[model samples]
Target: GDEDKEKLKREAERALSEALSEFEKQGKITPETLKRLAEEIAEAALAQQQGDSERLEKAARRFAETLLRALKESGASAEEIEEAIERIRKALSKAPSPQLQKLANSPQWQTALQEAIKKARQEKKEKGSLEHHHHHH
Candidate 1:
């Protein structure tokens, strides 16, 4: 059972990672784009877990972290990343799958949202302070 779960998790992560690269190539992160990406990730996570809500939630958490990592690496401001995460949450809430809709309100989802936002804001501050060093160039 663990083996199967691991396989499913990897598949879901790969699916999101691949889609994210394509998304990054487009060079924009809008509410619409976040919504579409959220839908795709929800579908992938659901496909992996069948009807197991716990496993699906775990997969959703992984997907959320992966997406946040991508956004952070893209150098988006903290506010931008937060708004994108909000868009993703809205999309998940409106998802046709009941499991996905539940996931939007899950504690795990809220934790990830808050944690990622905190980290992004910290990074933004660090980057802000480093801006003055660019004068050496």
Candidate 2:
């Protein structure tokens, strides 16, 4: 039933939020920590649906976006973020999970990583300045 599915989704979301905040509190954003986060989300997704590739990929992408946001808010340097990305790629490439391997090689994942790096660099350039600009087209 859809209700059951909704419940599962909620649980997964809670898991993600809790894990993220725990990492944030620890204040250690190493590549290994990120990888562990990803694996935890993957496990939760798998629990929702076995062998569901689409579900797994969606989890991966969600984790990626959330991770980047967390890193940005934590004031991670662009170089540190890039190094973490490289480490995750290297670790996932040889992982036993096909889903992890897929994520490691996917163009979408690559694009997300690149975009995060660019954003981190831009944020650094801003240097703790707050400027609000509105664009109308």
Candidate 3:
């Protein structure tokens, strides 16, 4: 159990890192976009740990909604938005893995999630304050 939890912790860490890397690659670092992307990844990471099938599906759908909302506000074209949505649709159609299901139920995911949420909020808060202060100058 401990070994599995450790593995899941690493997996969760890797997933967050990969998501953040892709978020940056979008080359659009608008505060809103960054905040939205970070929050979505964190949310999705936690969702992956849910023990209930219905809750898991709900989390997936919520993540999809976040993606659509983010894309819409990112000045992306309609086609790009449609494609992203389609990709998520296809991913959801496939069966989820047992490894992830177990990981989602592990204490590891929840532990990492608390850290992720804390850091994301701090970054966003700092940026917001800086922007507001700079606007006054």
Candidate 4:
């Protein structure tokens, strides 16, 4: 059976976490910094020298395609791309605001993190033989 939208939603959600991780490693998620990063990414992704609505939209579409291939190996469908665009646009609309802090504190983010950890653990367990591994040696 085909995976449902929740799976695709989770895929999109993971991309957000990775994006945040990339930013957080640089230290602090200041509003102005995030705003500038968004502008820069959009500008660079579009190979543009200035920020404009068209450039941002085009970059976002390209991002969705790249993100999809990175995640599912299949390019994003038009509907999925539109959904991602809506989600990203909505998130960007809240830039330079404390709303982002609240989003980080969201139950959904916590749940996703926990689920990711569990999955990682499961994959690790499957990758190695428990009996063959050393014990505190």
Candidate 5:
């Protein structure tokens, strides 16, 4: 049983890796995007294992919103941004199957979200300063 589960997890990881690889090949995979994807996958998996559809969906929606904010800051196209948002909508429509309930209790996701927010704000600030400097010259 353990072997079978390990094998399945490996396959799942490989599939996810390949999916992200396509975006990389298309020049659409930034560090932030990768971080978001990996974090969401882990969260979704935890939610599924815990059978917390409401909490998962709520968290999923908020994370997707945050992701859109970050992507917009990076100058992604309107179509690209819409696609990202749509993906989140589609994902949240599914219920969590029901893992580490402890994972659910962990602050890791919260910490990551905060870091993402902080980075987005810092970037916006830097961009504003650059614009101001240019105007002053």
Candidate 6:
């Protein structure tokens, strides 16, 4: 329990640092901007007595929004932002369990199953016909 708490703290600190540092490294968001944004996030994520979970989620989302806004303001090109978004989406989509994943992404699973079934059935018909009515081609 202690280690888990420490790990959470450490990870949260590192994430916050990276968010702030990214702007600095890019020469985009200033220290003042970063500080202001960080403060707002901390307020949003630590407002209530039971705020950590919701706050954490909101904080990340809010920070991400700020990043996008800054990028847009700075006329930044979409070099890696799309890939980052894809990575985040993939992380969110993951279920760590195959059964659990199906519950969320079942539409994809259903389509894949249907396609596979259609191909299998087509192959079956083709095989039957080819075996009986053979021709060279």
Best by lDDT: 1
Better of 3 and 6 by lDDT: 3
**lDDT over C-alpha atoms for residue 1 of model 5:** 30
Q: How many clashes in each structure?
A: 0, 0, 1, 0, 4, 0
lDDT of 4 by residue, 48-69 (tens): 2232345434544444334433
What TM-score does structure 5 among the candidates reach? 0.42
RMSD to truth, every model: 7.9, 9.1, 11.2, 16.1, 10.2, 21.1
lDDT of each residue in 29-99, candidate 2, tens digit only: 44444544565445434433355555544555566666666565555667666655565565555545455
* lDDT digits (tens) for residues 1-137 of candidate 5: 32223422332333224434545466555554655554554554455555666555555445645665555644555455545444333332331322322333334433444444444445443232111244342
- Measured on C-alpha atoms, candidate 4 has an lDDT of 0.36
lDDT of 6 by residue, 1-137 (tens): 32223323332333334544554676654655544444433333233323344544454455455545544444444543332223322322352423222322334322332433333334332212113444455
Rank by lDDT (best first): 1, 2, 5, 3, 6, 4
Residues 41-83, candidate 1, lDDT per residue (tens digit)?
5554454336554554465566566666556545667776676
TM-score of 1: 0.53
TM-score of model number 6: 0.36
TM-scores for all predictions:
0.53, 0.50, 0.38, 0.28, 0.42, 0.36
Q: Which 10 residues in a row give candidate 3 its minimum summed lDDT?
A: 123-132
Name the runs in model 5 displaced over 4 angstroms. 1-29, 85-137
Clashing pairs in 4: none
Q: lDDT (CA) for every model shown? A: 0.53, 0.52, 0.41, 0.36, 0.44, 0.39
| Residue pairs of candidate 6 with colliding backbone atoms | none
* lDDT computed for candidate 1: 0.53
* Residue-level lDDT tens digits of model 3 in 57-105: 4444454455544554445444554444333223223214344444344
